[PDB]
Amino acid sequence: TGLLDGKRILVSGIITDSSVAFHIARVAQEQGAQLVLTGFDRLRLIQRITDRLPAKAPLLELDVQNEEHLASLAGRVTEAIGAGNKLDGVVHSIGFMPQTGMGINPFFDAPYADVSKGIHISAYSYASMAKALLPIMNPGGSIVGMDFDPSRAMPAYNWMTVAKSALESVNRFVAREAGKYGVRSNLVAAGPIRTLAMSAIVGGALGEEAGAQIQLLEEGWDQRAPIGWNMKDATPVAKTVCALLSDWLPATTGDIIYADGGAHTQLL
Amino acid sequence: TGLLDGKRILVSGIITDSSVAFHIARVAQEQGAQLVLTGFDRLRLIQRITDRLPAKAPLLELDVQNEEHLASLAGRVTEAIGAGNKLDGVVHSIGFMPQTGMGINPFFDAPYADVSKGIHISAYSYASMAKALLPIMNPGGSIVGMDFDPSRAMPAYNWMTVAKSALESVNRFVAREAGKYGVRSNLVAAGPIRTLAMSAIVGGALGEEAGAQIQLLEEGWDQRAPIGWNMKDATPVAKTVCALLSDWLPATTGDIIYADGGAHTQLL
Amino acid sequence: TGLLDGKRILVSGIITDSSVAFHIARVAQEQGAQLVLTGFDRLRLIQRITDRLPAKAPLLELDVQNEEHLASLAGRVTEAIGAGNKLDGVVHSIGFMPQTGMGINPFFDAPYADVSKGIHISAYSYASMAKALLPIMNPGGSIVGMDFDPSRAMPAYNWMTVAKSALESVNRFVAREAGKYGVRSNLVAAGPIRTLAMSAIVGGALGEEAGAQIQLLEEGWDQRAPIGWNMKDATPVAKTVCALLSDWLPATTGDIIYADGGAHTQLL
Amino acid sequence: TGLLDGKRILVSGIITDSSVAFHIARVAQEQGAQLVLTGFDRLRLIQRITDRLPAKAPLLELDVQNEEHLASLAGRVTEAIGAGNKLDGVVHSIGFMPQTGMGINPFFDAPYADVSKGIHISAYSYASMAKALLPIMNPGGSIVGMDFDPSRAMPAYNWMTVAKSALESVNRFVAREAGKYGVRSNLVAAGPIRTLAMSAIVGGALGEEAGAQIQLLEEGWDQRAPIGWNMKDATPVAKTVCALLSDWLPATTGDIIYADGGAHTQLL
């Protein structure tokens, strides 16, 4: 019971318990939402991970690059939530960019095939998911994707930043479509969260200079953030996602909410 | 009970029952907040107006241009809410620009004395209010001001748009100060709301061409808005203000939330 | 002689005499630049078109999706301009999005393969071109790409707008690379220009509703533009491109100059 | 002779030889412009300073807060340039904020009277100057003001940043007016320039912490700037101002050109 009581919400993007989407799922359940989860490749893993969620939630396979998965998606969700029931919320918390598109690999050296896959999973799939799910969403519904502010270039994030810029653009178009359904579409631009991958890149997985730069990035983020930024705490971002899934931001779409400690509003 | 249960929130800016702040007050009370109101010049009027709020709320005079009012403000609020109690939220819903700074009066013809008064009440007072009230705000608190997106120029709004640009700048600095207190500071950029004044300007009070332009503005807003925009309904904006007053946007400050139907994210 | 006197500048993107790049080429030559042109598929056509340029300019084939073309590009340019000579400027005036990614074809119905090709040619190729050409660019050099402001969604332009958002992101990264060479990288966001394709879409080639919307778009652009916008005149944009190719914007990179009549700075 | 040959251009804001406007004046003269200068309080000083300009230029007193100065301004300029001659360019390079509005003085402690004076001189005067001078400007003319990117808050700059936000807003409205005259209005957002005042604040004139912060600000600016930023060199900014005064940015108004080394396009 609470912020999302009675809402049926699909949450994609759980892969581990430090997945941003894990915390989104957890908070949404604490707030009364009934979840359907989608998981990409390692469903056994994901099932075991989501066992620790406050409540049980059906898990559906969704490889966002798999047209059949997307084509079957709404029927599978309807099976999961019961005929005559629709989704009130959809959470896109998916992103990927091949290593060549990031870190120390020179920006110019990322082969387009890699970039394109990154943009497919990280940006285009936002529209894919909305296409699959809008038919089974209620008026007053909410689609939320995860963004990392790409409005300025930065070290290491390279083509993933490009992918986020594309995602932000996609979101504005998804909002136009979603609006026909009485549905809002918005992004949450989060501060840096020490996910496994972020920890790995800080630890030098994508090159020492990239690691050093990302560390400087996270330090400066907390410094700039008027209320600070705790990269080890995804809860403030999960809460923000939940804010958008709720009825409490009913006049916002095609938009980006910055759950980044206010870092983006401050130069130094 | 609900979104704001237990929160003590000061709401400025009620002058009539069509004041944006009236609806902010109403929704906040429906959501469990305990209010203190401030009212500017016509306290008898404002008291009679706020009698229709779901709950009684002490009303304090606050002329934001009156240094003594601001100097006494926190003690008066403490009297009203009880010693040992602090505010959790502050709503700045105040704005004013002399007629010369708006409408058909040529932009170049607004005397600086008029502009300055407009900027005093509409922008600087955001910092004034934060200065007066941050000492009596709890950690986790929230200050929210009302904004109208000034990022592009527009007909008729003239120097009030300039004042909003200044307000947005002020908010970013107020966030820096507020952050020391564990307090967030944010603006809600609302779509156009058919307040008495907006109705009056549509009806030609500031010149026929200004009226015509503002009418075109509100029509285009609803057209652009992916979810539409109902200028006769301040509830979606009151709800958004409440979202920011709540614990559900805990990593956003110095920021602007657009409760405008998504109009600003769409060109045409 | 003039603004670009002595500069050696590669201009991509001429396909017809109404190509934005044709006018960029023409103005650059009027201003003293020595050009190398690249042309994509119809070289005989392009040669015949560029015969009308004020001066002769070597034409090199460049299919931006062809890795060999890009791999050979700098040597071919060096052959064309003479060993020991480098480029001072590069103009990316290339864009393409399959029909499915635009117009009346539902946004959700653009297959990723189409989108990806669009993003390849329209966004990624900006980095491709910079990768190929930075080794043969002089310090103080300038790379300029053509942008159409994607900061808000719009009818009909659909995935091309997404591609522009990606391009703007790419440009910011290209600037980081280009900076190592003493080279600036910038976009020109032009107003709508009645190119063959734009005329075709206005005339209904991508659906009547798309045509109607684009017509409304161009009308509103001129209305919003404080100095007007003449979609039949690419000269103000060619001049702006030339401004960026010149030494007169020497502290601007990763940036976007808006040659749009000021339309983007105005709401209504 | 050159970029501005034959143009008659009013350049305000020279106070010393390290004034940004001194370099704007110098470059404009090197480029063929005929100047009229305006100077604020110390005309003897300013005359002696501008004696070192490449060419002689009439100097007119203009206190932008003095309505009579502004009321007489266009006739005095016409006297200076000759009846039947008009201005082609106007440079607003004026700014001021009382000490209370900056540095270590708490943001909340700047009395509105101080802020208002700051906003008067730094923002409103942009409109004042355009009002005074548009009647005596040629079609194809250009008004340029000096901006410091206020889109994010920063240490020390406090209410001057607010003033710049207001200036940027004013510029968008001035463009609407200027457009009626065939005149463009634009800002140049410069990187930090080690003007006397900036040197003084770095040296602790407005508090040690403000000095330290501004020093960090200038260091980070050069680091972020893809082409670097040399705060001791106003020439790249003078050149940019000249770019806008020229015919080479003929489709840009109400706009801001960033002569900041690209720093604003980069996060880290």
Ligand SMILES: NC(=O)C1=CN([C@@H]2O[C@H](COP(=O)(O)OP(=O)(O)OC[C@H]3O[C@@H](n4cnc5c(N)ncnc54)[C@H](O)[C@@H]3O)[C@@H](O)[C@H]2O)C=CC1
């Ligand atoms: N960690 C951070 O600092 C920030 C992350 N974000 C965004 O949050 C979102 C979630 O990522 P995180 O939780 O950080 O990492 P994560 O690695 O835990 O989540 C990424 C998810 O994307 C899924 N995915 C990858 N390819 C897929 C495909 N083909 N089909 C379906 N799912 C696929 C993965 O299985 C995984 O669940 C991403 O969009 C990310 O860019 C935004 C701001 C900051």
Ligand SMILES: NC(=O)C1=CN([C@@H]2O[C@H](COP(=O)(O)OP(=O)(O)OC[C@H]3O[C@@H](n4cnc5c(N)ncnc54)[C@H](O)[C@@H]3O)[C@@H](O)[C@H]2O)C=CC1
């Ligand atoms: N009506 C609209 O379309 C939009 C309004 N807003 C903003 O919402 C806020 C509230 O305005 P509305 O509700 O529309 O109009 P309103 O006229 O009902 O509220 C303005 C309030 O400001 C108060 N005020 C004026 N001078 C004051 C002073 N010296 N000291 C203390 N209070 C003073 C008035 O008493 C009144 O309560 C304003 O900031 C306005 O700019 C934002 C977007 C759109």
Ligand SMILES: NC(=O)C1=CN([C@@H]2O[C@H](COP(=O)(O)OP(=O)(O)OC[C@H]3O[C@@H](n4cnc5c(N)ncnc54)[C@H](O)[C@@H]3O)[C@@H](O)[C@H]2O)C=CC1
């Ligand atoms: N026409 C307009 O209203 C606006 C156009 N722009 C941009 O200006 C640029 C030039 O386009 P326009 O002159 O309008 O149209 P255009 O059709 O004359 O130019 C597009 C060019 O891209 C080239 N191209 C396509 N695929 C290519 C590939 N594989 N390799 C190399 N070149 C390829 C074409 O051959 C053609 O020369 C584009 O980036 C466009 O998006 C920007 C704002 C407005």
Ligand SMILES: NC(=O)C1=CN([C@@H]2O[C@H](COP(=O)(O)OP(=O)(O)OC[C@H]3O[C@@H](n4cnc5c(N)ncnc54)[C@H](O)[C@@H]3O)[C@@H](O)[C@H]2O)C=CC1
């Ligand atoms: N120095 C810097 O790092 C940056 C400065 N700018 C802007 O460049 C512009 C010029 O300032 P700077 O050259 O840096 O300093 P400056 O101190 O040399 O120029 C300021 C000018 O404003 C004039 N002024 C002050 N009050 C006036 C009034 N009542 N009437 C007429 N003129 C008045 C002063 O006499 C002086 O000539 C200002 O708008 C400033 O904010 C923009 C970005 C950075």
